[PDB]
Each structure stands twice: as structure tokens, then as C-alpha cells.
């Protein structure tokens, strides 16, 4: 049985490995999400997962793909630690408290609470990472920061500690939607496969269920994700509120804009989840048997 130290250390490393591997997908998602906000005279247009990544690598280099990565690693550490140390206690309070099974309701509430606390703790990392991923020298917007800690100090000094929590409520709602949609969709798909006997219950079945649920959650959260990215990236004063940003997006680009960066978002969710699962299991097994 993995101890807490090996679980916490394994979760941190698996999350960080998955993040460094799938970070170009996240950067491509952000670039696709902020593309139509401000018109650009440059002929550099982002279209697709590999199209966006290749355009970024050609016009800005490889290190521009991993811009804000230290912020992403900090977020991964805090989120993984909060999962390993808090999702356990709330879940076991809901299950063993009434001696009930981990029903979907208990799972929904546990994920909601853990995700909310994690979003609140890791919001400054999200602000810094999103602004660094979206900043570019080629579209007429002057980059505000040179790196993760430059961004940290500049945001803190010029706009307060509170300004490091900009976009918490969109991120919090997006977390709620991701969690609820993913859990409901996975249950519905797995019950369809197991009752209609469309597929046998082996890990291929759970993989199809999880992939379908991840895509459904990504599609369901895409409007909030686009609005959250644009709001977090915006400098002070551009948007009166988060509904203001959403309404401007709607009236100036339409319902399709709310799904900008949908393919990179879903690919990063799926690849991150599989990489973290594999790395986490292998790492905690080797640390426990070491």
C-alpha cells in the first residue's frame, strides 16, 4: 500500500511529466482561443493543433511553446497535492460516513469541493501561465512579461495580489462543468456499453467511456474556457466583467468562437490523463516496492 509520501510525490511527478509533455497542446489551445480577439496584420493564422504548434515553432521558436511552463508546473504540484490529500478525506467522509458506496452524487460533490479548492489555490499560476502562453511579438500586442516570475512580480506590484486571482469565477464554473459533465457522461456511456453489451467491460471499454466523457466535458466547458482565457488574458479595464467578455465574444464572433481551441483542449485532456495515470501508477508502485 502506497504511503502518503509516495502518493504525494508520485502524483506531483506524474502531473508534472504529463504537463511538460502536453504543454504545447495547451499553448496551442490558448493561441487559438485568443486569436480573433484583436485583429492582426500579420499573415500568421492559427488553424489546427499541429498547424498552430508548427506556426508557433517557426515564427517564435520551440521555447515559445513552453511559455509559462513553470507556472504550469506549480499549478500541477498544488492541484495534485490537493487531490491526493483532500479528495481522499471528503470522499471517505461521504462513503464511510453513512457506510454508503461511492455513488455518483458523492463523487460529484467530492470532485466539486476538491476542484474548487484547487482552482482557488492555483489561480495565480493560471493567470501567469495563460498570459505568458498568449503573449506574442507578432500580433501587435506588446508582451507584458519576460517569464513566470517576472509576470508574478509585475502583476502583484502593478495590480495587487487580488489581480493574481483574476478569472477565478470563470475557472471555478469551468471546473464545475468539467467535473459534472465528465462523471455523468462516463456513467451513461459505461452503462450503455455494459447493458447493451456493445463492448465487453475490459479496459478498452473504460477507455472508450473515458474518451467520450472527456470530449463531452471539453465541449461542454469550451464556452466558459474561451471566455475565461480571454478574460484572464485581458489587461485591466478591457472587460467590465466576465459576462461582458462573453457578450462581446458572442456579438463580434458568434457561437463558433466559444469553441475556439476545442481540439487542442480535448487532446491535452486525454493525453494528460493517460500520461499521468500511467506515470503515477508506475511511479508509486516503484517507490513503494523500493
Amino acid at each position: 500500500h502506497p504511503t502518503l509520501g509516495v502518493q504525494l510525490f508520485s502524483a506531483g511527478i506524474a502531473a508534472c511529466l504529463a504537463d511538460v509533455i502536453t504543454f504545447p497542446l495547451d499553448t496551442a489551445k490558448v493561441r487559438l482561443q485568443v486569436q480573433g480577439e484583436c485583429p492582426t496584420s500579420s499573415v500568421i493564422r492559427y488553424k489546427g493543433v499541429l498547424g498552430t504548434i508548427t506556426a508557433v515553432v517557426k515564427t517564435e521558436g520551440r521555447m515559445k511553446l513552453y511559455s509559462g511552463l513553470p507556472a504550469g508546473l506549480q499549478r500541477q504540484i498544488s492541484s495534485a497535492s490537493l487531490r491526493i490529500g483532500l479528495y481522499d478525506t471528503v470522499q471517505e467522509f461521504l462513503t464511510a460516513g453513512k457506510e454508503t458506496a461511492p455513488s455518483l452524487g458523492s463523487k460529484i460533490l467530492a470532485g466539486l469541493t476538491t476542484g474548487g479548492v484547487a482552482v482557488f489555490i492555483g489561480q495565480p499560476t493560471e493567470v501567469v501561465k495563460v498570459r505568458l502562453q498568449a503573449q506574442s511579438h507578432l500580433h501587435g500586442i506588446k508582451p507584458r512579461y519576460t517569464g513566470t516570475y517576472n509576470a508574478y512580480r509585475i502583476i502583484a506590484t502593478t495590480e495587487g495580489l487580488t489581480g493574481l486571482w483574476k478569472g477565478t469565477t470563470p475557472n471555478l464554473m469551468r471546473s464545475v462543468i468539467i467535473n459534472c459533465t465528465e462523471l455523468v457522461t462516463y456513467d451513461l456511456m459505461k452503462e450503455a456499453f455494459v447493458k447493451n453489451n456493445i463492448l465487453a467491460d475490459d479496459v478498452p471499454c473504460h477507455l472508450v467511456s473515458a474518451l467520450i466523457a472527456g470530449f463531452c466535458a471539453t465541449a461542454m466547458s469550451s464556452p466558459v474556457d474561451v471566455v475565461k482565457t480571454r478574460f484572464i488574458n485581458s489587461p485591466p479595464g478591457q472587460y467590465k466583467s466576465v459576462p461582458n467578455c462573453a457578450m462581446k465574444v458572442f456579438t463580434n464572433e458568434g457561437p463558433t468562437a466559444f469553441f475556439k481551441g476545442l481540439v487542442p483542449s480535448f487532446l491535452r485532456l486525454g493525453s494528460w490523463n493517460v500520461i499521468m495515470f500511467v506515470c503515477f501508477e508506475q511511479l508509486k508502485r516503484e517507490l513503494s516496492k523500493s
Epitope: 484583436c38 485583429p39 467590465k240 462581446k248 458572442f250 456579438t251 463580434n252 458568434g254 457561437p255
Partner: nanobody, 121 residues
Framework: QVQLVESGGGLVQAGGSLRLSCAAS????????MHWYRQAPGKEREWVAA????????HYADSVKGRFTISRDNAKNTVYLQMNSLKPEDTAVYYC??????????????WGQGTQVTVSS
């Protein structure tokens, strides 16, 4: 009932200045980017300038950048085009434009009637 009304055009000597105004009506202008186009006869309508919903960014055609400035006031529902060092090739009908995208496949263009700007040489 979208309605854009341009004004302020007229006959000006080359090198002179002119401020075009656009009174917008029938829609919440605080949410829409506003555009200035122009068209001279024998030519196609040329995009001139664009301004963000609250004036956060402004973009110009390369032919007018520096000479033309686009400006906004949402408390008066008005969009402004200041034109300086005017030159005879700027003689055209200038059009206020709203691209209302909304629940649509493509954006829908709402135009004004245009105001005529004639530059004498």
C-alpha cells in the same frame, strides 16, 4: 432597428482635416466593434478603420494609418473618424459599419448611408 447615420463629410482642400461622426442607434453599441469603410466610384468599398467595443484597440488600413484616427464614445452612441493631411485620393463616400455576428453563420453588415468627403487639389 439598427440605424447608422454618418455626418461631418464635406469639401476640403488637400492637406486639410475633417472629423466624421457616426450616430449609431437601435443596438447596444457598447458590445460591437465599429468599422469605417469608404468607396469611391469606379472602385470597391475599402475598409478604412476598426475600433473595439470600448475602444481598447484601433486598427487602420495602411493607406490611412497616421493620417486617420478612429475614436469612440458609447455614452453618445457615436463613432468618430478624424482625418488629417487629406489628399485627393481620399475622396470617397465614407460608411459606418457594424458587423453583427450573433446567432448567425456569418456576420451581417449594417451600413450607414455614407457621408461624402471630397478633397480639392
Amino acid at each position: 432597428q439598427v440605424q447608422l447615420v454618418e455626418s461631418g463629410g464635406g469639401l476640403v482642400q488637400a492637406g486639410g482635416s475633417l472629423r466624421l461622426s457616426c450616430a449609431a442607434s437601435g443596438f447596444p453599441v457598447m458590445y460591437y466593434n465599429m468599422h469605417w469603410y469608404r468607396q469611391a466610384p469606379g472602385k470597391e468599398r475599402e475598409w478604412v478603420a476598426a475600433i473595439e467595443s470600448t475602444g481598447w484597440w484601433a486598427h487602420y488600413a495602411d493607406s490611412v494609418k497616421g493620417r486617420f484616427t478612429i475614436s469612440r464614445d458609447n455614452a453618445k452612441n457615436t463613432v468618430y473618424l478624424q482625418m488629417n493631411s487629406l489628399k485627393p485620393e481620399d475622396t470617397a463616400v465614407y460608411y459606418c459599419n457594424v458587423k453583427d455576428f450573433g446567432w448567425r453563420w456569418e456576420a451581417y453588415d449594417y451600413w450607414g448611408q455614407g457621408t461624402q468627403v471630397t478633397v480639392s487639389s
